[PDB]
């Protein structure tokens, strides 16, 4: 008896995002999405460590869903018979029934259809939450993604100015808890169930073994670096379902940042580093001003460099020597400065 | 020589709050509170682990004190002779003398009276701080609570609109550091003094063994779930004297959130998850829109599910199918969708 | 071909700050700074633990640089031949080339000159970042500081009111990762290179052994406490290049706080505790209202009291009994209150 037009959305794997409008003149629709749970072995680091992952749609993170304020979101959650345990979904964007979790518990072989009204604007986490200690285990096994609820007039700066992005990426950050043997080597398991007890022991100490973007160390570097061009305004949505993060674009800034991720709040301007509280998504716009490689990290640099949490942007364009220049290339230190430099020891 | 009316306040145990007005037409008063230090053995988890706690008024957290801007707060701190060590109090709401700590050090058998002017609006931590390494030990042994300094016109949205709560709860979150023996079992001690050396070693590694609301895992679930009704605007004050938290109302939102907890700042709107920086209190309003069970957690879900940091609300009322509905109950996956679902692996 | 006046700045060791104007009527200048890298053994705690530090200008943190919006900042980075490895610099204030890191890699015996335009107002981290796992190692070995880019009209409250400080201090917070032997004693090394492998193992577990201000436990206490006077408005800049912090002025507040550190954003008012996200600087103003000792901490009190993260202010002036008073000094508990006090157990 909800008498609105239906609009079917085909999700795409992160860090890319399905087609959508920012500002729209469409009225509310029933926006139809399908998420299929896949338990699978995944590679999580550069040394080939494997992990018995649990995912929405086969990815870590799960895909970004994009709708507008006042849309209804009708989600078909599917739990294929090849999976081994029950799964459900909690949308932080939704109101009631534990975000949908109390209405979406499905055994392998089942599917369920949940509808929730998009009454709250922002980027939000969604994640599996089957009950009790399965909640954090499913989440840190990979069962989390995000949904973006745009205002119908698109983003604004909180001061009556339209903001429009030329390009959007979704960076899901994942804390992983991989058991080690007595020698310190990561252990392999044949099934998520078999990994559980040893994994819970690692989780209890609250220190991840890996902190990764798009499901693995190096996922968003090399061949898979994120592309942009000088002059493009890029929206970077960052989610972390379980653990804090502090995103930073090395060589750039956050021109407009919704740290808490909710578009009813004016963004902060000109940030160096922002903060994603665990259990949320945030978003930053940046207009690229310089070409070259940028590193996008969590700015616990140990996590970024040593536990997997670095992405790269490769930005095409022309260097701006006014914003930054190498005045003198590396050269031998001159002897006339010896005394003066002795004051800086 | 302070010539103001005196108003005696009877504190109540958390998560409840003593009677108070939001908006008031009273002038400044000397608001009189008594806190009695109690060192006692307490049960902190569902498996019956005990802990040599140190508390204000016998609870973790200590009770919420509520006053208005411009009140004077006259605190009688009592340290009964049955206690074993000196205690004092630091009010983050207060100006000078280390928040009062430098004026309130009392041995067992003594009491002291401190007055501080409520010049700063917000929710604030108070905690014991006797000196040196006793400061964190007393705090993580339970000696912390909060005080709320309301504007005399009550809360506002920072945009000239009154906000009024129908119901207030105080959620004190406590990080606990319980030693284990060689087998991993929590160790028991006969006195706080005896627990100290082993406890300090756990504290030094910065990883709590337990993270609890209202002093124990499960405190605010079952018989002790928090009650509300659809339509009620509920203020949830959350404090953490030592360690960060990221509160989230599962199935709800923060309609108005003062993350940093200070009412001279406009609240943020529509948050999924907020952030309580260790050593502070914050506050969130929410108007319940749906009945049923809600989980209120720190959204490090390992802490929430596995270390004790889950509360429940039980909300009475009528379900709103417009905000959320189960369109189709769990059903066998249909064979016609096989090919299409293969794209989501 | 940049045709602007040159202004040479002599840096001073933290927590002090070189001479500068807040509001200025000068036009843009090329502001000339020199940073000299010094690898050296440093003492980091009260028990005399040593550490093979790597620094800018011989200090942890590196010195605070102060410029105005629209200045160009011409940095001569020097890597003396007595050092053992390559170093560079990333300015979070700068746009392009990984903050300057991709233009400033210098071997021992070399120097380089980088110019970056100060287009972004705020306090910002700068740090070494030579590549890969050297990035966090160099940073947590001490190679970080901060730069402040003031608006040309000085600070404002975001509501068209000038804010002016009478006194500025720069508090650099440093997370340190010092290996221990089998007995738990901190280990000593002859060179940074020799310390690396054991240090990386500690870094990987994300738990610092020490958390210090101005490079060592106790640095800013006793003889080196920070001075102020009642009535002075003090700007406290706090940076943390790698790890979150939650600053708190015990006995005071943050009157105006830029938690994220960027002056294009209105400050928050009346904070108890604020949050420095790792990889950033923030800033707080406070006008002292009371004399006496204040403790300035990170309000993980375990870090503050037990891992080194306490500074002191010594504030001269007259006590204000209206803001706070000891109404009654410690006295024996009276027998008439016995029954009533039994309700607070
Ligand atoms: O009390 C509401 C409770 O039920 C859920 C599902 O588990 O939504 C349902 O609520 C009622 C059942 O008690 C019905 O009125 C409604 O039709 C049903 O969908 C939860 O969302 C909520 O927690
Ligand atoms: O980390 C402890 C210890 O384990 C070893 C192998 O014994 O390496 C493991 O840990 C490294 C750090 O996580 C990984 O790079 C590697 O994949 C894993 O086998 C040692 O090398 C290390 O000292
Ligand atoms: O310098 C102030 C210092 O003293 C305290 C108490 O320990 O408040 C006191 O301050 C003065 C004593 O030096 C007196 O003028 C005043 O009467 C007294 O209460 C501290 O609050 C402060 O740190
Ligand atoms: O946690 C390590 C190890 O210790 C054991 C008992 O040897 O359990 C202890 O730790 C559990 C997790 O904190 C608690 O649930 C329990 O109360 C405590 O005795 C093992 O079961 C566990 O592997
Ligand atoms: O693609 C830009 C890239 O180069 C750097 C230095 O490593 O700045 C340089 O950029 C170009 C070289 O590819 C030149 O046009 C420019 O002169 C030069 O300084 C980096 O900052 C940036 O990442
Ligand atoms: O901390 C573990 C263990 O090591 C010892 C010496 O064996 O002390 C070391 O650690 C202390 C805490 O960091 C330091 O204060 C000290 O400098 C260091 O040698 C033990 O005393 C302690 O139990
Ligand atoms: Cu699941
Ligand atoms: Cu959640
Ligand atoms: Cu105490
Ligand atoms: Cu405190
Ligand atoms: Cu370096
Ligand atoms: Cu950086």
Q: Is A143 in the active site?
A: yes
Strands (E), A231-299: 233-240, 247-250, 254-258, 268-271, 280-287, 292-298
Interface probe for B, chosen from A2, A209, A242, A279 (most Cβ of B below 10 Å), is A279
B222 and B140 together in one domain: no
C197 and C120 together in one domain: no
**Closest-CA residue to B198 (of B207, B190, B189, B211):** B189
- In a domain, residue C33? The reply is yes
C128 and C179 together in one domain: no
Structure tokens at A333: 């230190």
Structure tokens at C92: 């979070």
Alpha carbon nearest to ligand 6 atom 20, residue = C184
**Closest-CA residue to C94 (of A75, A289, A120, B89):** A289
> Could you tell me if A189 and A122 are in contact, meaning their C-beta atoms sit under 8 angstroms apart?
no
**Closest-CA residue to B59 (of B206, B213, B162):** B213
C131 and C44 together in one domain: yes
C90 and C227 together in one domain: no
How many domains does chain B divide into?
A: 2
- In a domain, residue C334? The reply is no
A204 and A314 together in one domain: yes
- In a domain, residue B326? The reply is no
B194 and B111 together in one domain: no
- Neighbouring residues of the ion ligand 9, judged by CB less than 5 Å: B 87, 128, 138, 143
**Closest-CA residue to A219 (of A172, A277, A266):** A172
Q: Give the alpha-carbon dihedral of C113, C115, C121, C125, to 10 degrees.
A: -30
CA distance B151 to B22: 8
In Å, what is the CA distance from A162 to each residue of A168, A258, A262, A268?
Answer: 16, 15, 16, 15
CA distance B89 to C217: 25
CA distance B28 to B219: 36
CA distance A326 to C102: 10
- In a domain, residue C297? The reply is yes
> Could you tell me if A257 and A266 are in contact, meaning their C-beta atoms sit under 8 angstroms apart?
no
- In a domain, residue A107? The reply is yes
Residue of C69, C90, C173, C175 with catalytic role? C90
- In a domain, residue C342? The reply is no
Domain end marker among B106, B133, B151: B151
- Please report all neighbours of B, defined by 3+ CB atom pairs within 8 A: A, C
CA distance A143 to A53: 8
> Could you tell me if A78 and A111 are in contact, meaning their C-beta atoms sit under 8 angstroms apart?
yes
Domain end marker among A95, A125, A151: A151
Bridge partner list, A120: none
Structure tokens at A317: 């364009």
Bridge partner list, B325: A115
- Please report all neighbours of C, defined by 3+ CB atom pairs within 8 A: A, B
In Å, what is the CA distance from C23 to each residue of B210, C154, C261?
Answer: 50, 4, 18
Kindly report whether the peptide bond that precedes residue C336 is cis, defined as omega within 30 degrees of 0: no
Domain end marker among B136, B151, B166: B151
Q: B260 in helix, strand or coil?
A: coil
Q: Do B319 and A242 touch (CB under 8 A)?
A: no
C72 and C157 together in one domain: no
The atom number, within ligand 6, closest to the CA of C209 reads: 13
A18 and A160 together in one domain: no
C13 alpha-carbon distance from chain centroid: 12
User: Range of A233's domain?
Assistant: 152-318
> Could you tell me if B324 and A115 are in contact, meaning their C-beta atoms sit under 8 angstroms apart?
yes
Nearest residue, CB atoms, A301 vs list C35, C121, C242? C242
CA distance B202 to A333: 49
CA distance B87 to B56: 10
Q: A160 in helix, strand or coil?
A: coil
- Please report all neighbours of A, defined by 3+ CB atom pairs within 8 A: B, C
**Closest-CA residue to C273 (of C240, C297, C295):** C297
Angle at C159 between CA A264 and CA C278, to 5 degrees: 65
Cβ of A293 less than 6 Å from ligand 5: yes
The full DSSP string for A287-317 is E--S-EEEEEEES-HHHHHHSS-EEEEEEES
Residues in B 69-98 with any Cβ partner in A closer than 8 A: none
Left if phi > 0, otherwise alpha if psi is -120 to 50, otherwise beta: which for B56? Answer: beta
CA distance C7 to C33: 9
If one counts every other C-beta atom within 10 angstroms of the C-beta of residue C339, the result is 7
C138 and C246 together in one domain: no
Residues in B 279-308 with any Cβ partner in C closer than 8 A: 279-281
Residues in A 14-33 with any Cβ partner in B closer than 8 A: none
Query: Token match 């901190």: residue?
Result: C186
Residue B294, CB-side half-sphere exposure with 13 Å CA sphere: 28
DSSP character for A29?
-
- In a domain, residue C343? The reply is no
CA distance A335 to A311: 42
Q: What is the 3-state secondary structure (H, E, C) of C162-222?
A: EECCCEEEEEEEEEECCCECCCCCECCCCCHHHHHHHHHHHHHCCCCCEEEECCCCCCCCH
How big is chain A by its Cα radius of gyration, in Å? 22
Q: C98 in helix, strand or coil?
A: helix
Alpha carbon nearest to ligand 5 atom 11, residue = A319
A122 and A52 together in one domain: yes
If one counts every other C-beta atom within 10 angstroms of the C-beta of residue C167, the result is 16
Q: Do A330 and C120 touch (CB under 8 A)?
A: no
Q: How far is the CA of B274 from the centre of ligand 7 (A)?
A: 24
Structure tokens at C245: 């912090």
Cβ of A264 less than 6 Å from ligand 2: no
Q: B303 in helix, strand or coil?
A: helix
Is B127 annotated in some ligand binding site? yes
Angle at B196 between CA B192 and CA B198, to 5 degrees: 130
Q: Do A251 and C110 touch (CB under 8 A)?
A: no
Query: Token match 């108007």: residue?
Result: B287
CA distance A220 to A214: 7
Sequence-separated (6 or more) residues with CB below 8 Å from residue C161: none
H or E segment at C140? Answer: helix C134-140
CA distance C11 to C65: 7
CA distance A81 to A59: 18
Kindly report whether the peptide bond that precedes residue C166 is cis, defined as omega within 30 degrees of 0: no
- In a domain, residue A343? The reply is no
B135 and B219 together in one domain: no
Angle at C261 between CA C256 and CA C263, to 5 degrees: 75
CA distance C277 to C261: 10
Is C159 annotated in some ligand binding site? no
A39 to chain B, any CB pair closer than 8 A? The answer is: no
> Could you tell me if B271 and B254 are in contact, meaning their C-beta atoms sit under 8 angstroms apart?
yes
> Could you tell me if C155 and C22 are in contact, meaning their C-beta atoms sit under 8 angstroms apart?
yes
Residues in A 243-272 with any Cβ partner in B closer than 8 A: 243-244, 260-262, 264-265
Kindly report whether the peptide bond that precedes residue C332 is cis, defined as omega within 30 degrees of 0: no
What is the rounded end-to-end Cα distance, in angstroms, of chain B? 76
DSSP character for B282?
E
H or E segment at C313? Answer: strand C310-316
> Could you tell me if A179 and A199 are in contact, meaning their C-beta atoms sit under 8 angstroms apart?
yes
Q: Pick the residue from chain A with its C-alpha nearest to C137.
A: A302
Sequence-separated (6 or more) residues with CB below 8 Å from residue A183: none
Q: Give the alpha-carbon dihedral of C120, C125, C127, C133, to 10 degrees.
A: -110
Q: A198 in helix, strand or coil?
A: helix
Nearest residue, CB atoms, A132 vs list B269, B305, B323? B305
Residue of A49, A54, A127, A203 with catalytic role? A127
> Could you tell me if A200 and B305 are in contact, meaning their C-beta atoms sit under 8 angstroms apart?
no
Residue of A42, A45, A68, A92 with catalytic role? A92
CA distance A325 to A319: 9
Give, for ligand 6, the residue of C51, C179, C184 to mutate: max count of ligand atoms closer than 8 Å to Cβ.
C184
Q: How far is the CA of C164 from the centre of ligand 12 (A)?
A: 29
CA distance B289 to C43: 58
Interface probe for B, chosen from A133, A266, A277 (most Cβ of B below 10 Å), is A277
Bridge partner list, A146: A64, A125
DSSP character for B322?
T
Angle at A179 between CA A177 and CA A183, to 5 degrees: 135
CA distance B90 to B35: 13
């Amino acid at each position: 008896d909800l008498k609105l037009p239906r609009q079917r959305v085909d999700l795409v794997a992160p860090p890319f995002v399905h087609v959508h409008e920012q500002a729209t003149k469409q009225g509310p629709k029933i926006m139809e999405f399908k998420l299929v749970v896949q338990e699978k072995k995944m590679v999580i680091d550069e040394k080939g460590t494997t992990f018995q992952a649990m995912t929405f749609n086969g990815s870590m993170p799960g895909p970004l869903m994009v709708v507008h304020e006042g849309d209804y979101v009708e989600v078909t959650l599917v739990n294929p018979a090849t999976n081994t345990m029950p799964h459900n979904i909690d949308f932080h964007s939704a109101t009631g029934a534990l975000g949908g979790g109390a209405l979406t518990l499905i055994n392998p072989g089942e599917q369920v259809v949940l509808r929730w009204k998009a009454t709250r604007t922002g980027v939000f986490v969604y994640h599996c939450a089957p009950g009790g200690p399965m909640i954090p285990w499913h989440v840190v096994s990979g069962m989390n993604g995000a949904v973006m609820v745009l205002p119908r007039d698109g983003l604004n700066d909180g001061h009556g100015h339209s903001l429009r992005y030329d390009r959007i990426y979704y960076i899901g950050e994942q804390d992983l808890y991989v058991p080690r043997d007595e020698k310190g080597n990561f252990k392999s398991y044949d099934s998520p169930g078999e990994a559980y007890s040893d994994t819970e022991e690692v989780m209890r100490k609250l220190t991840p073994t890996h902190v990764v973007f798009n499901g693995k160390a190096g996922a968003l570097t090399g061949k898979n670096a994120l592309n942009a061009n000088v002059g493009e305004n890029v929206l970077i949505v960052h989610s972390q379902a379980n653990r804090d993060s502090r995103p930073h674009l090395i060589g750039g800034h956050g021109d407009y940042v919704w740290e808490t991720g909710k578009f009813s709040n004016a963004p902060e301007t000109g940030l160096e580093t922002w903060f994603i509280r665990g259990g949320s998504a945030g978003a930053a716009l940046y207009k690229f001003l310089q070409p070259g490689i940028y590193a996008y990290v969590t700015h616990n640099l140990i996590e970024a460099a040593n536990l997997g949490a670095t992405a790269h942007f490769k930005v095409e364009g022309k260097w701006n020597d006014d914003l930054m220049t190498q005045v003198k290339a590396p050269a031998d230190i001159p002897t006339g400065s010896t005394n003066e430099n002795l004051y800086f020891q």
